[PDB]
Amino acid sequence: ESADLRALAKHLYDSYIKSFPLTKAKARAILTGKTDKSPFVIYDMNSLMMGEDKIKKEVAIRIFQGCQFRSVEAVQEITEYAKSIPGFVNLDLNDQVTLLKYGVHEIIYTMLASLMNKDGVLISEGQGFMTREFLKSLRKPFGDFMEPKFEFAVKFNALELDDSDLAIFIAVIILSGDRPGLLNVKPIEDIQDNLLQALELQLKLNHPESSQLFAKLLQKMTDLRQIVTEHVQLLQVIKKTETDMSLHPLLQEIYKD
Amino acid sequence: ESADLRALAKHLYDSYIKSFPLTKAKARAILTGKDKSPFVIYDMNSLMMGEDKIEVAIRIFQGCQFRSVEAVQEITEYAKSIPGFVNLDLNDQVTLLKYGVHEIIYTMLASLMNKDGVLISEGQGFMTREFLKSLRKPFGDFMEPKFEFAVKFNALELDDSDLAIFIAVIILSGDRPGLLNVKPIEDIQDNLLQALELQLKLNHPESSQLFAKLLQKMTDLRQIVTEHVQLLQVIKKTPLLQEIYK
Numbered sequence: 001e002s003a004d005l006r007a008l009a010k011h012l013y014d015s016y017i018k019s020f021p022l023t024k025a026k027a028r029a030i031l032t033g034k035t036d037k038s039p040f041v042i043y044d045m046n047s048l049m050m051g052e053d054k055i056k057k058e059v060a061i062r063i064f065q066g067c068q069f070r071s072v073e074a075v076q077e078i079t080e081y082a083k084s085i086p087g088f089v090n091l092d093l094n095d096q097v098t099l100l101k102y103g104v105h106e107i108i109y110t111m112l113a114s115l116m117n118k119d120g121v122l123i124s125e126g127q128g129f130m131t132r133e134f135l136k137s138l139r140k141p142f143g144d145f146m147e148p149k150f151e152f153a154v155k156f157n158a159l160e161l162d163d164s165d166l167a168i169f170i171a172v173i174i175l176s177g178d179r180p181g182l183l184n185v186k187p188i189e190d191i192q193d194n195l196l197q198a199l200e201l202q203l204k205l206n207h208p209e210s211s212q213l214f215a216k217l218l219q220k221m222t223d224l225r226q227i228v229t230e231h232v233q234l235l236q237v238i239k240k241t242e243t244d245m246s247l248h249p250l251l252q253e254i255y256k257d
Numbered sequence: 258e259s260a261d262l263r264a265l266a267k268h269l270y271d272s273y274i275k276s277f278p279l280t281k282a283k284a285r286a287i288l289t290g291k292d293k294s295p296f297v298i299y300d301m302n303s304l305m306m307g308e309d310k311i312e313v314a315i316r317i318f319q320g321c322q323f324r325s326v327e328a329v330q331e332i333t334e335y336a337k338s339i340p341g342f343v344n345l346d347l348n349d350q351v352t353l354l355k356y357g358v359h360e361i362i363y364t365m366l367a368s369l370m371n372k373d374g375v376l377i378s379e380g381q382g383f384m385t386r387e388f389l390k391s392l393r394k395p396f397g398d399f400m401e402p403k404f405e406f407a408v409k410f411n412a413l414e415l416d417d418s419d420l421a422i423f424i425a426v427i428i429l430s431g432d433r434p435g436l437l438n439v440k441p442i443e444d445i446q447d448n449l450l451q452a453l454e455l456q457l458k459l460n461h462p463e464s465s466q467l468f469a470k471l472l473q474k475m476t477d478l479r480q481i482v483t484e485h486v487q488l489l490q491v492i493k494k495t496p497l498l499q500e501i502y503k
């Protein structure tokens with residue numbers, strides 16, 4: 001039944017709204033210009049100094065630590081979301097941990113796109129906007145930790161997904177039977193089969209004119225995986241050049257591989 | 258309607274058979290049973306003997322390079338049979354082939370692999386997985402991740418009919434760097450993906466979301482390709498021939 005699939009789509013959307021305070025719908029309203037929602041714009045060193053004044057070491061470092069503490073929050077929301085995915089919680093505990101471990105970054109970059117356009121990114125729950133050019137300005141190695149994310153975001157935002165589509169997509173990502181060290185792959189794949197079935201129907205109903213959006217979206221997973229590996233290599237460099245610099249344990253457990 | 262998709266699937270099948278001499282159906286027959294068993298290479302002495310029937314890790318690696326170059330031409334001919342491919346900007350054609358060939362070489366190599374080895378020399382031979390892994394560094398950890406991909410990929414149980422459209426979808430990727438006119442490429446790929454989807458529903462009616470799982474395998478291909486290129490760069494630190502194989 002299509003109906004069982006629609007109900008699973010409605011359940012995941014609902015749960016996505018409960019888990020993630022800044023939706024794509026909100027992020028777009030802020031970026032697009034729908035008076036009360038307008039962000040303060042950080043494009044240079046003086047703007048940054050003024051940002052603390054209303055928005056919520058050394059500059060590139062302070063910014064980078066800012067993202068790290070923001071990724072940790074995101075891991076906490078994504079983890080909350082995951083428990084809502086039917087069956088995830090019944091999986092062997094080790095696997096739950098493995099799925100989260102490899103799923104969490106791909107999801108972060110998927111949702112980060114929602115906060116992005118060609119020339120910048122939303123910050124402090126949408127109160128701020130930091131320009132892409134200011135971020136690329138940052139002293140090396142931090143100059144280009146964000147560039148690949150912008151590049152993916154511009155391409156990904158071209159699909160015009162809305163939140164109800166993404167809720168199912170990030171579910172399909174978490175429930176990948178193809179992660180290293182999975183003890184029981186089979187229970188994971190039956191859940192994903194179901195999620196994929198629900199995505200498929202949801203894209204066809206919600207995006208009727210968008211030929212092969214399902215396929216086109218699944219190919220994006222390749223771009224996500226590429227982004228993750230590049231970030232890891234960049235982190236390796238930071239820990240060597242900035243030995244003073246501290247990484248959050250939660251993030252540091254995710255990177256152990 | 259679907260009749261234009263079925264036409265497309267048969268066309269591509271017919272072209273894939275003409276372009277690739279050793280098909281998956283034929284490679285399977287040999288790996289499992291049914292009529293000359295291949296000369297098996299499992300040891301240094303089997304290799305030596307096998308050259309007569311058909312500076313070690315290096316000889317084997319240059320053979321992989323010779324065969325990959327043969328496969329490039331087979332794939333180029335196939336590509337030209339894909340509707341719309343020859344009508345694309347010539348530079349776009351070279352770019353699609355340039356970046357698409359490694360992914361397809363590994364896709365098709367999976368047809369020639371099982372978990373314990375790979376067929377060589379048009380199926381006249383069989384080089385065992387253990388003897389490849391056995392080879393000194395960095396040649397040992399070289400073929401090992403393709404076996405890993407091939408085991409997972411073969412579990413989808415695709416046949417030649419299916420892979421012919423899949424290969425076509427790979428070649429028509431609009432995200433290759435430096436493309437000049439992405440539109441007609443995406444337009445062809447959209448049409449190929451519709452053809453692949455219908456193929457998999459008719460040909461594998463009980464295999465839920467096979468289309469989706471197959472597309473998910475594109476991630477693994479690109480990961481492998483990127484890993485391969487990183488091993489090549491390390492080999493580069495170990496006459497006319499350099500030129501031919503580049």
Ligand SMILES: *[C@H](C/C=C/C(=O)/C=N/CC(=O)O)CCCCCCCCCCN=[N+]=[N-]
Pocket residue numbers: 056063064065066067068069070071108121122123124130231235247251
């Ligand atoms: C930051 C998004 C980061 C993505 C990412 O993957 C980062 N990884 C870092 C890592 O792995 O270590 C872009 C938005 C800019 C953030 C600026 C927010 C300011 C908050 C300050 C809070 N201060 N503290 N602590």
